Design an enzyme around this catalytic site. Sequence first.
Site, mmCIF file in Angstrom:
data_model
loop_
_atom_site.group_PDB
_atom_site.id
_atom_site.type_symbol
_atom_site.label_atom_id
_atom_site.label_comp_id
_atom_site.label_asym_id
_atom_site.label_seq_id
_atom_site.Cartn_x
_atom_site.Cartn_y
_atom_site.Cartn_z
ATOM 1 N N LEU E 41 0.983 -1.260 0.201
ATOM 2 C CA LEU E 41 0.164 -0.234 0.124
ATOM 3 C C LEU E 41 0.891 1.265 0.463
ATOM 4 C CD1 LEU E 41 -3.158 -1.044 2.564
ATOM 5 C CD2 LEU E 41 -3.055 -0.755 -0.106
ATOM 6 N N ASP E 42 0.403 2.473 0.898
ATOM 7 C CA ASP E 42 0.339 3.681 0.253
ATOM 8 C C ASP E 42 0.401 4.189 1.666
ATOM 9 O OD1 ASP E 42 2.740 5.885 -0.087
ATOM 10 O OD2 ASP E 42 1.263 5.746 -2.594
#
Lengths: 459, 128, 177, 99, 87, 155, 65, 79, 122
Positions: E41-42
């Site tokens: 993810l970020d």
Amino acid sequence: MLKYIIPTMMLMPLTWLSKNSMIWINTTLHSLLISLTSLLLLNQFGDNSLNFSLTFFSDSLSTPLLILTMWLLPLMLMASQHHLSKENLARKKLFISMLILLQLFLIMTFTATELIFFYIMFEATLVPTLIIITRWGNQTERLNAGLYFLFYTLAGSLPLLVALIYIQNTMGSLNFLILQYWVQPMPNSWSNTFMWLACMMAFMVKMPLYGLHLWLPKAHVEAPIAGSMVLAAILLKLGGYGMMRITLLLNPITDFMAYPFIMLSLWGMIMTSSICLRQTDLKSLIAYSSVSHMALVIVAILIQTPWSYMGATALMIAHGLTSSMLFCLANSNYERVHSRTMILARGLQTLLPLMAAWWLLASLTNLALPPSINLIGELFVVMSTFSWSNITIILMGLNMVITALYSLYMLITTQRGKHTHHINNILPSFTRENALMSLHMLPLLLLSLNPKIILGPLY
Amino acid sequence: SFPKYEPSRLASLPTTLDPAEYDISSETRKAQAERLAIRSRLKREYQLQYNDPSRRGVVEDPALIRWTCARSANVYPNFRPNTKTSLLGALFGIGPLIFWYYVFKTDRDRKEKLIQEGKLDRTFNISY
Amino acid sequence: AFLPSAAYLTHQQKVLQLYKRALRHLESRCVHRDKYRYFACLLRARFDEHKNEKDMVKATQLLREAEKEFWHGQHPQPYIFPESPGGTSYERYECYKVPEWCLDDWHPSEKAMYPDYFAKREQWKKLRRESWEREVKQLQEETPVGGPRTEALPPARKQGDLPPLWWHIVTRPRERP
Amino acid sequence: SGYTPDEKLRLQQLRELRRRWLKDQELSPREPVLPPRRHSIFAFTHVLIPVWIIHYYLKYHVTTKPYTIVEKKPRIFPGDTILETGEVIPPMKEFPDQH
Amino acid sequence: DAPPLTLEGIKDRVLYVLKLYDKIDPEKLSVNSHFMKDLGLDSLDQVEIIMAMEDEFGFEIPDIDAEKLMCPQEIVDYIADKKDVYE
Amino acid sequence: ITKDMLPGPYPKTPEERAAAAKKYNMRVEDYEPYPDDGMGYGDYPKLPDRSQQERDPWYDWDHPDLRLNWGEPMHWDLDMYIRNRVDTSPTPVNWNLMCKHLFGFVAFMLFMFWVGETYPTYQPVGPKQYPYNNLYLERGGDPNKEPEPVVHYEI
Amino acid sequence: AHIEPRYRQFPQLTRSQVIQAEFFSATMWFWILWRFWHDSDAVLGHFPYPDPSQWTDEELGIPPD
Amino acid sequence: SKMELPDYKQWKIEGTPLETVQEKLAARGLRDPWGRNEAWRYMGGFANNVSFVGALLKGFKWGFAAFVVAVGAEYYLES
Amino acid sequence: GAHLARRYLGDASVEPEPLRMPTFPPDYGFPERKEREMVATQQEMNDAQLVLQQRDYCAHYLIRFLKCKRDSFPNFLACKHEQHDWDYCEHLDYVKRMKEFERERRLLQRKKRREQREADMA
Ligand SMILES: *C(=O)CCCCCCCCCCCCC
């Protein structure tokens, strides 16, 4: 008045011949019996005052103060028997003898029909008070508080005696019953100007007056609980009683003379209420509130109307009871947290519910919630000072707001909000403390039913 | 473009709009380092004195006692009478007293003068 | 620059906090869910356009202009969660969070109404008073010279002992007393 | 940054101790062991008795004193009849009808 | 009013909210799955996850605690500690 | 407590400034006392003068009610900047614009109220007519003085 | 006994409260319609309003010269 | 104590304005990954809410019927 | 409502003012005008305790309505016919007041026309 002086003097053989630990019980019991017998002074007539002999007489003005003093002595003994539990037995007996002697001088002050005898007892109340403050206090500054309390009062009272002696060389007598019929008008002159100043500045000092009030925040917050009670509830009324007795001889020069002191008190009530809005100490807050209320009484006496006199005596009695209750509340909090900071102990409603109720009730009676006698006295003074001038109501009305701005504040910082986390010595409320606050409040709430006994000698 | 915020006495500048917050120089980082060190040492002392099971009382704060002593008992020894303090005292002490004395004297003189000539309405005023 | 564990806020935390505040204010601006979703995707595009910017001072100036943009167009009355500070229900139940040590002042007549609970309380007090000196010796031997640097407390690194200064955090009153 | 392992271990142990403390807050079925110790009552002790008391108070102690309970006089209309002495108030003048 | 929350309920709710996310395929994630390495993810996606749980559970997580939450077990433990579950 | 921890006179030498900064538990560079103009402040520090509402509410404060720590130096006006009292939070709108808008709103509506008081509105009718000489006896007039005869005619 | 809470679906409804709500809405509308049918003058107007400019000159006593 | 949750697979954005949002984003070029989380509000028993004029006219039918019945009844009793 | 626009935005010397009416004599232009007649006696109006503003020129309808309302307790909607009669009478009084206003306005306009003719001939 010999039927009240003799038991008060016999209280000292009671407290000196008592047992090792039965001094408090015997003194409280017999002082409560004296307070019960004090109600016989209510034999007042609509025209005539009660005259006992050539030395002692009791009007309808001195009677509530006498009843308040003889009621306050057992409350004083109940209040001052917790911080003296570690004291020596001889020192404890000396403290009780000091309280008994002070009460004796107080009940001999109010009944004096001679102004010289009244003045002698009025200064004789200084020595036990000064001894109590300078000996049984807690801080260092009490020693400084032993000076500002003393050399203020004498500086007002040593000229006044001379003026009183002048009356003895002018009117032929200083008896108050004689002077009510032999009084003369006072013409406008510099001699009568300075005689008015001599006869008044002692009572402005001991009330106190704004500007001359500097001894009261110092002698209230270093003194012990009994000393705080005796300064707040009785010793500030000697000035009012002396004013009411001495205003008769100072007419009609008082009409243009009372202006600067009226302005001083009318601005000093606002100044002291604003000071109360920013005080970090509970005891100093109560002291400055006392200064404001006594400035109001000064205005009421100086404008000299019947409604003003009625409001003045009602305000005197009500303020005495309320200030005594507030000082006992502050003493209980100080005994529980061992500090005088307002911001230290917060949120005490979650720990003491009944003490929170007593705090709320005392703050309610402080801001003169009707139909308490505080509202009766303050209202009547407001009516009289509106009759005096139509603008002064503004200087009253704003003051009222500031009163409701600090008393509730004095509630909130001590009662509401999140409790402090690092204080864990909060004991539950003792039965003695709750008994003290109930004995302080229940006469004050009961006096609203029949206020005609505290409405002065011209009701 | 966008209306820049004006700081005020009762409306301070936002923390996220402060230019001095965005400085990444060495001195600011060092100042934050010993500020955090002082705060951590004080917090450690407080919570060490606070979680003691043998202790039953008030954890005394020297800062509170210092503030209460500086507010009350340390005003006169740090006072010097000069032009500013004397001017402020003369303006705030005897100014309002003179103003209120003049106002009340004028009002009472006007009311009394109306009373003597009988122009003032006192038809029912019998309580005073 | 006021943190319990750190001394400053880095650039990444500043960008993340600005993004969170901007998204919350955008949610407050448009009431409905679909419009908020559309404009949140638009804001995500606006933030993702300048993600890979290796110039540090350009990132700082972008942060400053984005903060000015957010301050220009934020809601006058943003949505606040009821338990969040500034909310309607914030710190409401602090009048019922009675501390535990008040139970030490209870009368023995009312202490007999809950026997087993007070037995467990006595056991807890015995555990605390027997672990206090061990945990304070753990603290005094781990803190460096010149006091601790941060406010982070060490864990319990031994077997049988408890983490230091555990009493007033474990025995805190519940959120709904 | 994520969780530092040392304070992660501290959080785990603190959570375990907090869960044990919260488990200890429940009550046994015995606790609390307490110490050992008419349909128209509200219509009688709350209405009828105060009505009797204050009706006695108003009848024999308030109306005894003069000018305590002062009442607005009843409205007298033309065509009515006075109960006190039987006089009849004459009706009004014949109306100049408009509709 | 205010029905009690159990650890099973909180874990089920956080897995439901994470399963309703299009960036996370439901056949790979686990309860001990890290956002940055296990799922890729970020940081902005982490902020979106945090505010999604905030809107789901009706209470706000502060940023200093939100930045250290990177796995569903940590979120479960944080919500369990805040809501005082398992009493 | 002890004597050399209470506040004292205004520091002049840098060594006295460093000692006062160590006494007040902060850095020497951040220790700025009040200017010695003779107002009685002494060596008390001049804090950045903001309310306690601007503090972080999520931090583990020692006194969460006042948002204050233990041992940190208090403001000289801390009793004024509590959350029960005056707040200095940053407003979304500038102070001068808010004040000018409020004053313009109040002044404009007061002026329009005065203008509308100058020119009132009504309905096209004459004065109301009351019988019996405009009810002379019913207005509290004396019965001995016969009133001036006011007669109203049918229209 | 009681209503069990549901997760992200429509809540369970009681027949009694639906019946009461419909009855009270119907009573409100019936009361409004009945009062508008019977009274009908407090809304539209109690009395006609004559035109002041329509009054003739000789009934107003205007002297023609 | 045990609250079972419905199936996660039914929450699709079909028939909702979230597809209108999806079409707008796809025309622009982005994705909306949170449509399925907010899909529960627009489907099920919460779909097809009434308008404002239909909200003000709640229970108007039965009230009109009762008004007609009462008017006919009073017309019968007045004769 | 147009009279406000005619008086403020127009000329105030023609529009009558509500503070003082009438300025024309009541016998000017009206041959042998008749006065309004009072039906309710002063004593009957006195012992009925009518409000002073309620003592208009047809308070007898109000007295009859109050008597009917008092004598039809508890049927508070029984005899609204008396209320309708009182409302019709006060409506007729308002019509008379409007007629007086129009008469004053027309007489003022006639006076303005007369002075305009005097200005024209001179
Ligand atoms: C004649 O025009 C004067 C009417 C009374 C004064 C003006 C009243 C304005 C408000 C009421 C009418 C509103 C119409 C939309």
